[PDB]
Write a protein that binds this ligand. Structure first.
Ligand code: HEM
Ligand SMILES: O[C@@](Cn1cnnn1)(c1ccc(F)cc1F)C(F)(F)c1ccc(-c2ccc(OCC(F)(F)F)cc2)cn1
Length: 528
């Protein structure tokens, strides 16, 4: 009789409920652990799914090894399963597509197939504020990028260069890390100096003199507070009743308030010029459907732009210094270019003269190859995607993960990829260049193909608009570093490994270099 079997399901259920809590809280952990191992083995038999990396702890997935060393994880996975493979990350399924075909599959994915804001909104909305970037539909983001880029013109760059140069020299004069009028040599942590130099140069040029003046006050602490809110933790715990979260949110309110204060005072005096990004968004932030951005949204977009460029740029100048510190040959070669292009230093550095410095630009270009600030770019898959020339279907609710930074470091696309060699870019010093046809998603013509193995600024609709600002900033900064200082490592030190757990792939610190003045008796003028 099978009826007697069902009685014993009932009985056995009643006996299960009566086991000691030693056994039951055992069995609450044992049952999903074994059910997970069963589900994976069954999953491995589906041929319409990319291979899934095996993991033990349910939900947590491969998070630990991915988070700590993602390029090593990808290379081991790539040897095992080829270029397309999935792995489980703190509750989500990430499908990785390595190589140029992966750049194409993700960066050029149809707007209806994937969503960046669905992957990213919790990462950034708590830090930037509401209504901008990833807290708004894609069509709003596109036009927001059009607004910001409209202030990022070559004529803006010609005016930013002397301003950035003034900040770099101010920092050499006044910062405790240098004091070039009092000290001719010294030790700095590049992960202390570069964030400060970056925010000082970016504030002065994009935000204007008033906002730059605030960082000389206690207001600087709010920037520090807000900056600590910029962490990948926000992926999992975006809001918590802790203290870190309170100063972050306070700082966002306080900083966006200072921006709205300045915006509302410029409009009441009609003090609206072409000075900085604030003027620019004030004159040009009405969407095509007629909606104006609010003063709050404009301020929030300013925080997003300044914050993103802060961490990519600061990490990149740190890496440039760290690589050059063990390459006095490269510093020497860069210095000769500076003497030739600037008539032994008797020409004032201009945006135009920066474009005549191919080796300096190639040094930035090579640093960005070896240290892509963003090792992984995410999209949430919104409807099922067929992976061309496979039987693979990526179902909706998965995520796709693209990693041009991994391809940057492959010998097949960059011979001797782990060697720093700026001369691999000889007669190719452009920050990037569209290898053919262009398309415009709402913020300007950009390259249509994204199959280049070198993609420091991504591609497609979510492509960076900061590239020329970053090269302007990095170029002025490194031109002055080169002309002012030599530097090298403390004894037995070398290039640190990256910190992949962070918001960008910044160097693991402290990472110290010893600078020395090229001209001990050179003084920097001005009052302090
Ligand atoms: C060397 C410096 C930088 C590098 C390597 C870099 C890299 C990138 C990458 C890879 C993306 C694509 C992200 C994705 O597909 O999810 C991106 C997007 C973006 N970046 Fe940058 N960035 C840099 C500096 C800047 C600067 C200086 C700014 C602003 C002044 C900026 C603002 C933006 C914006 C607005 C986006 C658009 C994101 C979207 O539309 O989804 N970045 N950047
Ligand atoms: O793409 C950024 C960064 N940026 C900065 N400049 N250019 N791009 C961004 C985009 C637009 C902005 F307005 C401001 C931004 F900061 C971003 F949206 F925040 C962003 C997206 C993803 C990531 C990121 C993705 C994956 C990560 O994995 C590491 C982890 F496994 F979580 F530990 C860590 C970080 C970081 N920043």
């Amino acid at each position: 009789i099978v009826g007697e079997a069902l009685e014993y399901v009932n009985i056995g259920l009643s006996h299960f409920l009566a086991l000691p809590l030693a056994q039951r809280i055992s069995l609450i952990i044992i049952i999903p652990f074994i059910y997970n191992i069963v589900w994976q083995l069954l999953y491995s038999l589906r041929k319409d799914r990319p291979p899934l990396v095996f993991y033990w702890i349910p939900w947590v997935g491969s998070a630990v090894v991915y988070g700590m060393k993602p390029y090593e994880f990808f290379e081991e996975c790539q040897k095992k399963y080829g270029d397309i493979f999935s792995f489980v990350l703190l509750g989500r399924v990430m499908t990785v597509y390595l190589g140029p075909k992966g750049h194409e599959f993700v960066f050029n994915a149809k707007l209806a197939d994937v969503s960046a804001e669905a992957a990213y909104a919790h990462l950034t909305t708590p830090v930037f504020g509401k209504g901008v970037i990833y807290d708004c539909p894609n069509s709003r983001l596109m036009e927001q990028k059009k607004f910001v880029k409209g202030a990022l013109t070559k004529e803006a760059f010609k005016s930013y260069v002397p301003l950035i140069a003034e900040e770099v020299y101010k920092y050499f004069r006044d910062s405790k890390n240098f004091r070039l009028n009092e000290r001719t040599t010294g030790t700095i942590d590049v992960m202390v100096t570069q964030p400060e130099m970056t925010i000082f140069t970016a504030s002065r040029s994009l935000l204007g003199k008033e906002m730059r003046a605030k960082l000389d006050t206690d207001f600087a602490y709010l920037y520090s507070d807000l900056d600590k809110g910029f962490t990948p933790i926000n992926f999992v715990f975006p809001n918590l009743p802790l203290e870190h979260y309170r100063k972050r949110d306070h700082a966002q309110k306080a900083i966006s308030g200072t921006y709205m204060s300045l915006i509302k005072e410029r409009r009441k005096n009609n003090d609206i010029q072409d000075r900085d990004l604030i003027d620019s968004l004030m004159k040009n932030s009405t969407y095509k459907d007629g909606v104006k951005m609010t003063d709050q949204e404009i301020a929030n977009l300013l925080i997003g732009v300044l914050m993103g460029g802060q961490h990519t740029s600061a990490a990149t100048s740190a890496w440039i210094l760290l690589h050059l510190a063990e390459r006095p040959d490269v510093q020497q070669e860069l210095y000769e270019e500076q003497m030739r292009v600037l008539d032994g230093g008797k020409k004032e550095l201009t945006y135009d003269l920066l474009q005549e410095m191919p080796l300096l630009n190639q040094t930035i270009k090579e640093t960005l190859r070896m240290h892509h600030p963003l090792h992984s770019l995410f999209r949430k898959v919104m409807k099922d995607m067929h992976v061309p020339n496979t039987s693979y279907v990526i179902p909706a609710g998965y995520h796709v993960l693209v990693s041009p930074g991994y391809t940057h470091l492959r010998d097949e696309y960059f011979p001797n990829a782990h060697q720093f060699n700026i001369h691999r870019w000889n007669n190719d010093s452009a920050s990037s260049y569209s290898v053919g046809e262009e398309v415009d998603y709402g913020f300007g013509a950009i390259s249509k193909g994204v199959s280049s193995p070198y993609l420091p600024f991504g591609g497609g609709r979510h492509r960076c608009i900061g590239e020329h600002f970053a090269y302007c900033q990095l170029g002025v900064l490194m031109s002055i570093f080169i002309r002012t200082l030599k530097w090298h490592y403390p004894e037995g030190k070398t290039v640190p490994p990256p910190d992949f757990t962070s918001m960008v792939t910044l160097p693991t610190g402290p990472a110290k270099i010893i600078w020395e003045k090229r001209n001990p008796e050179q003084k920097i003028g001005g009052r302090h």
